[PDB]
Design a binder for this molecule. Sequence first.
Ligand code: NA
Ligand code: NA
Ligand code: NA
Ligand code: NA
Ligand code: NA
Ligand code: NA
Ligand code: NA
Ligand code: NA
Ligand code: NA
Ligand code: NA
Ligand code: NA
Ligand code: NA
Ligand code: NA
Ligand code: NA
Ligand code: NA
Ligand code: NA
Ligand code: NA
Ligand code: NA
Ligand code: NA
Ligand code: NA
Ligand code: NA
Ligand code: NA
Ligand code: NA
Ligand code: NA
Ligand code: NA
Ligand code: NA
Ligand code: NA
Ligand code: NA
Ligand code: ZN
Ligand code: ZN
Ligand code: ZN
Ligand code: ZN
Ligand code: ZN
Ligand code: ZN
Ligand code: ZN
Ligand code: ZN
Ligand code: ZN
Ligand code: ZN
Ligand code: ZN
Ligand code: ZN
Ligand code: ZN
Ligand code: ZN
Ligand code: ZN
Ligand code: ZN
Ligand code: ZN
Ligand code: ZN
Ligand code: ZN
Ligand code: ZN
Ligand code: ZN
Ligand code: ZN
Ligand code: ZN
Ligand code: ZN
Ligand code: ZN
Ligand code: ZN
Ligand code: ZN
Ligand code: ZN
Ligand code: ZN
Ligand code: ZN
Ligand code: ZN
Ligand code: ZN
Ligand code: ZN
Ligand code: ZN
Ligand code: ZN
Ligand code: ZN
Ligand code: ZN
Ligand code: ZN
Ligand code: ZN
Ligand code: ZN
Ligand code: ZN
Ligand code: ZN
Ligand code: ZN
Ligand code: ZN
Ligand code: ZN
Ligand code: ZN
Ligand code: ZN
Ligand code: ZN
Ligand code: ZN
Ligand code: ZN
Ligand code: ZN
Ligand code: ZN
Ligand code: ZN
Ligand code: ZN
Ligand code: ZN
Ligand code: ZN
Ligand code: ZN
Ligand code: ZN
Ligand code: ZN
Ligand code: ZN
Ligand code: ZN
Ligand code: ZN
Ligand code: ZN
Ligand code: ZN
Ligand code: ZN
Ligand code: ZN
Ligand code: ZN
Ligand code: ZN
Lengths: 172, 172, 172, 172, 172, 172
Amino acid sequence: TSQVRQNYHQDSEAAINRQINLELYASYVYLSMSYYFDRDDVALKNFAKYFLHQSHEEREHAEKLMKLQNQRGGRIFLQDIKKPDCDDWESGLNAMECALHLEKNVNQSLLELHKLATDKNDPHLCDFIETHYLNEQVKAIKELGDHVTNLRKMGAPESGLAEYLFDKHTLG
Amino acid sequence: TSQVRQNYHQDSEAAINRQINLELYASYVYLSMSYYFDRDDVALKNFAKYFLHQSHEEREHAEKLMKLQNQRGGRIFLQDIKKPDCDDWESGLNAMECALHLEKNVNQSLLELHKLATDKNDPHLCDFIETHYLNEQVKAIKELGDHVTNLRKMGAPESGLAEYLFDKHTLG
Amino acid sequence: TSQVRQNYHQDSEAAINRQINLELYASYVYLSMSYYFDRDDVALKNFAKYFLHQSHEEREHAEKLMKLQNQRGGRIFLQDIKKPDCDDWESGLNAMECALHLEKNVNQSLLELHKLATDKNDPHLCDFIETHYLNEQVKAIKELGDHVTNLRKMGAPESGLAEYLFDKHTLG
Amino acid sequence: TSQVRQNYHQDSEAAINRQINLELYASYVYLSMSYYFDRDDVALKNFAKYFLHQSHEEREHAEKLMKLQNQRGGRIFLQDIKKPDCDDWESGLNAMECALHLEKNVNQSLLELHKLATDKNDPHLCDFIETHYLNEQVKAIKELGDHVTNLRKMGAPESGLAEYLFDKHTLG
Amino acid sequence: TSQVRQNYHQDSEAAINRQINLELYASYVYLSMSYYFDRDDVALKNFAKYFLHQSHEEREHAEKLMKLQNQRGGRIFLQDIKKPDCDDWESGLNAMECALHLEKNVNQSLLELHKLATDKNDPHLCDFIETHYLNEQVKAIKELGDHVTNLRKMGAPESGLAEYLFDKHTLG
Amino acid sequence: TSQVRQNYHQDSEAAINRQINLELYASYVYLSMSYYFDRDDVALKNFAKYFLHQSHEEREHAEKLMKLQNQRGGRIFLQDIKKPDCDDWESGLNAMECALHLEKNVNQSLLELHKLATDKNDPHLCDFIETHYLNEQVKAIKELGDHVTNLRKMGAPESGLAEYLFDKHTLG
Ligand code: NA
Ligand code: NA
Ligand code: NA
Ligand code: NA
Ligand code: NA
Ligand code: NA
Ligand code: NA
Ligand code: NA
Ligand code: NA
Ligand code: NA
Ligand code: NA
Ligand code: NA
Ligand code: NA
Ligand code: NA
Ligand code: NA
Ligand code: NA
Ligand code: NA
Ligand code: NA
Ligand code: NA
Ligand code: NA
Ligand code: NA
Ligand code: NA
Ligand code: NA
Ligand code: NA
Ligand code: NA
Ligand code: NA
Ligand code: NA
Ligand code: NA
Ligand SMILES: [Zn+2]
Ligand SMILES: [Zn+2]
Ligand SMILES: [Zn+2]
Ligand SMILES: [Zn+2]
Ligand SMILES: [Zn+2]
Ligand SMILES: [Zn+2]
Ligand SMILES: [Zn+2]
Ligand SMILES: [Zn+2]
Ligand SMILES: [Zn+2]
Ligand SMILES: [Zn+2]
Ligand SMILES: [Zn+2]
Ligand SMILES: [Zn+2]
Ligand SMILES: [Zn+2]
Ligand SMILES: [Zn+2]
Ligand SMILES: [Zn+2]
Ligand SMILES: [Zn+2]
Ligand SMILES: [Zn+2]
Ligand SMILES: [Zn+2]
Ligand SMILES: [Zn+2]
Ligand SMILES: [Zn+2]
Ligand SMILES: [Zn+2]
Ligand SMILES: [Zn+2]
Ligand SMILES: [Zn+2]
Ligand SMILES: [Zn+2]
Ligand SMILES: [Zn+2]
Ligand SMILES: [Zn+2]
Ligand SMILES: [Zn+2]
Ligand SMILES: [Zn+2]
Ligand SMILES: [Zn+2]
Ligand SMILES: [Zn+2]
Ligand SMILES: [Zn+2]
Ligand SMILES: [Zn+2]
Ligand SMILES: [Zn+2]
Ligand SMILES: [Zn+2]
Ligand SMILES: [Zn+2]
Ligand SMILES: [Zn+2]
Ligand SMILES: [Zn+2]
Ligand SMILES: [Zn+2]
Ligand SMILES: [Zn+2]
Ligand SMILES: [Zn+2]
Ligand SMILES: [Zn+2]
Ligand SMILES: [Zn+2]
Ligand SMILES: [Zn+2]
Ligand SMILES: [Zn+2]
Ligand SMILES: [Zn+2]
Ligand SMILES: [Zn+2]
Ligand SMILES: [Zn+2]
Ligand SMILES: [Zn+2]
Ligand SMILES: [Zn+2]
Ligand SMILES: [Zn+2]
Ligand SMILES: [Zn+2]
Ligand SMILES: [Zn+2]
Ligand SMILES: [Zn+2]
Ligand SMILES: [Zn+2]
Ligand SMILES: [Zn+2]
Ligand SMILES: [Zn+2]
Ligand SMILES: [Zn+2]
Ligand SMILES: [Zn+2]
Ligand SMILES: [Zn+2]
Ligand SMILES: [Zn+2]
Ligand SMILES: [Zn+2]
Ligand SMILES: [Zn+2]
Ligand SMILES: [Zn+2]
Ligand SMILES: [Zn+2]
Ligand SMILES: [Zn+2]
Ligand SMILES: [Zn+2]
Ligand SMILES: [Zn+2]
Ligand SMILES: [Zn+2]
């Protein structure tokens, strides 16, 4: 047992390790999306920049969870980072919809983590999740929903002009 | 024989003279394209600026090859600069596709030059080509491919609105 | 076939995808090492900082390879990022020795990639590897060898005072 | 007929195209001279700089004529740029004398162009020629005549010391 | 075997040691030349400055090769630095011609080193030579050839006025 | 006889040439030491920096003696620079002891030179030696003796921790 460990349940430690893997997976998905939009036959540089930024953000989220795991005296156990579901993301609108799905999945995992911390009476972990992850997820989901709505209203994915102008004016 | 000449094959000297002519020809092609887009019945000022910039860049490439020829003790032999294949470049998309074709032709010539320098065991010439021309060509080809992709997706050449907005937002 | 693809062999494209996976794996290994040294029962903050910096550097190397893959018209195919070989890295000296082993493995992969590009007469790829990866690997290997030498001479891993003072004076 | 064309005779349009070719030819001649003086067995860097500057100036003159052609609604028709008469320019004095001959040829062409514009009652073209080309040619011819006079008086081409000191003190 | 050594052939290590000695020898030759021109009966201060600068440059080249030898895990073996061939360098023109000969000798040694590294499939060593030595040698040879050409054309060595004015205007 | 030579004995001229060779030899010894400490299996960067600085200082001493030789109208005669006695300097303490021995040898040579200049009634040479070399040698010897004393008291060469901390705190 770690000399710093206090009120940190083994179930919470395991769930934090699972969340670390999920954040690294999300980082990998976003990296794949970014370099899909960097292809010469897609060529939407601001979509690529947006998703690269999201990938780095998700890496930071994972690293903050690893720091938490050490702060509480738990032990980090890493697992394989599975490859993303797609190599070809088909369009800016499709990539935004997949990103929305992924962010809602990550949010659900975080809500289950908060429920577990509440059940184990771990207020520090509950506060950590609320302070650093929950409103970040709500804001990310709202932003992606806005992007999806605007692309659809502009005529994406059928309008390449729609995705070009969205790349310029919203993501630029 | 030049007092500075060392490990510089006559075949390499001839191929450098051929490359000088090819770069000057590319400069002339781009100059023609630029002033096509400066016509009152075409009137795409940022296409004109883009191609004028490319023309000056190709002139600089030719001058760097002439400097190399003198540095190695070879002798520059200039030839006629042939007129470009077109007077009317028909559209921004067509001009970008022709520019892509031209840059791939110049790249192929440079790869043949590198093969010759490798065969003649001229590492200074190989390094010169790699350092100053090969990645420049790869970047130029990727940029032109991106431009072609975006124009096609926006609906060029049938959409004059597409070429207008591309002129404003990508080339502006 | 990509509109930008020129002198880019399918074998080279596959080897670049393998190298991308290897760089991401190295990033993951370094991330694991960093947060091992962030544990309360290890508590070497400058070892943790060093390895976190290396992890971000390896991510950048992977992203540069993905950019190259797109520049040449190849297609990125991502694979699972396997978990690192260890969860517990045992000591600063042991982690440095493992890092040296990993960097020499990455260097060997890059040398095989250069041999393949030479065999396929791809001077742009050869130059890319030489310019951005080979001297970086040589410098990294020399630095890690220096660190290992100094830790051993100071008495690591048996001297915790040795690793403490190395953390302060070399990595701080 | 161009929507902007007014009081622009077809003969004037043809003569402007001929002048464009002549200016590009002069640019090429000066480029050849510059890199003759960049040879290791000639090695007069300020002669090389002088003639490179003249080459870029002549390119600018050609581009201004192309802009005029478009401003008036004429159509640019480019022709081959013939190679310069010499590969070896023999001396600084000989190159200056050839440059003087070339500038007087260009001036004669411009005077014939002005005569044509006067005959066609095209005051805008007459003013354009007078404002941008005629005094430039007179100044260039006077400068080259001064250079030739000084080189001859100093003892060029027989005095290599003469050309060395002229390179340093007049062109430097 | 060094813990950092990888893909570094013993033949390459020996050739690098030979090149180190050759660079130190060149530094010594240039030092001798510099202080020849510092004599009261020669008294060409800018020739002296030029050759002193070259001597320090060659020392830097040798030190960079020693750094490379250590970076790759080879072992430096130093040898005697032989005295220069002359104590009296006879004139500025003669010293420049000897310097040109020496730089071409060093260039030939570097080309043989590059051939050896290519034969041993050592791309890091090939790139090191190309990046840091080959174009430096080509530029140095071209500069010395230019200096020799100008001195000869000015009338050196028979004209002491020629060497005086060259010292002032080219080397000053 | 030089037009500037006055009260400069041939014995003094010969002894100055011998001292020039000795200073160049000392520079070479220090260069060898520096790059011994740059090895990956020694890895004491501040020892390497210290000895590289000493090597450049000894080169400067040699050049000042060459300047003196020319100032007095003597003629510089260079000899081979013999290789240093060791390739492997075994430890920081051993290298410092060898440096102390070398500096005392150079000091003895300078004292013999001063005795010769006194015997030949050459006060300018005596003053030159006193002003530029004698106190420099005394200070260098005292500094090296201090370094040796501290390394021994810290437990070098048996304590690698001793040499590591000396490298950091005294030489850093
Ligand atoms: Na997952
Ligand atoms: Na395409
Ligand atoms: Na979902
Ligand atoms: Na959804
Ligand atoms: Na849900
Ligand atoms: Na051509
Ligand atoms: Na083509
Ligand atoms: Na094409
Ligand atoms: Na091709
Ligand atoms: Na791997
Ligand atoms: Na503990
Ligand atoms: Na290994
Ligand atoms: Na190893
Ligand atoms: Na290996
Ligand atoms: Na003409
Ligand atoms: Na010559
Ligand atoms: Na004429
Ligand atoms: Na004339
Ligand atoms: Na006339
Ligand atoms: Na030699
Ligand atoms: Na005299
Ligand atoms: Na030679
Ligand atoms: Na020669
Ligand atoms: Na040779
Ligand atoms: Na000695
Ligand atoms: Na001694
Ligand atoms: Na002693
Ligand atoms: Na003594
Ligand atoms: Zn513990
Ligand atoms: Zn791109
Ligand atoms: Zn996240
Ligand atoms: Zn954070
Ligand atoms: Zn902990
Ligand atoms: Zn635990
Ligand atoms: Zn694990
Ligand atoms: Zn997925
Ligand atoms: Zn697609
Ligand atoms: Zn709690
Ligand atoms: Zn909290
Ligand atoms: Zn909102
Ligand atoms: Zn010649
Ligand atoms: Zn080009
Ligand atoms: Zn350039
Ligand atoms: Zn030349
Ligand atoms: Zn030739
Ligand atoms: Zn010709
Ligand atoms: Zn064409
Ligand atoms: Zn048209
Ligand atoms: Zn070569
Ligand atoms: Zn080069
Ligand atoms: Zn718009
Ligand atoms: Zn494609
Ligand atoms: Zn890497
Ligand atoms: Zn990068
Ligand atoms: Zn692509
Ligand atoms: Zn493919
Ligand atoms: Zn896949
Ligand atoms: Zn591992
Ligand atoms: Zn442990
Ligand atoms: Zn290639
Ligand atoms: Zn490249
Ligand atoms: Zn029209
Ligand atoms: Zn003109
Ligand atoms: Zn202008
Ligand atoms: Zn027009
Ligand atoms: Zn017309
Ligand atoms: Zn035509
Ligand atoms: Zn001509
Ligand atoms: Zn000539
Ligand atoms: Zn008019
Ligand atoms: Zn008038
Ligand atoms: Zn006007
Ligand atoms: Zn003068
Ligand atoms: Zn070793
Ligand atoms: Zn050198
Ligand atoms: Zn250097
Ligand atoms: Zn080493
Ligand atoms: Zn060895
Ligand atoms: Zn030896
Ligand atoms: Zn010599
Ligand atoms: Zn003499
Ligand atoms: Zn290698
Ligand atoms: Zn190569
Ligand atoms: Zn390298
Ligand atoms: Zn004398
Ligand atoms: Zn180092
Ligand atoms: Zn000294
Ligand atoms: Zn000094
Ligand atoms: Zn003297
Ligand atoms: Zn004498
Ligand atoms: Zn001698
Ligand atoms: Zn010794
Ligand atoms: Zn040793
Ligand atoms: Zn005296
Ligand atoms: Zn004195
Ligand atoms: Zn003291």
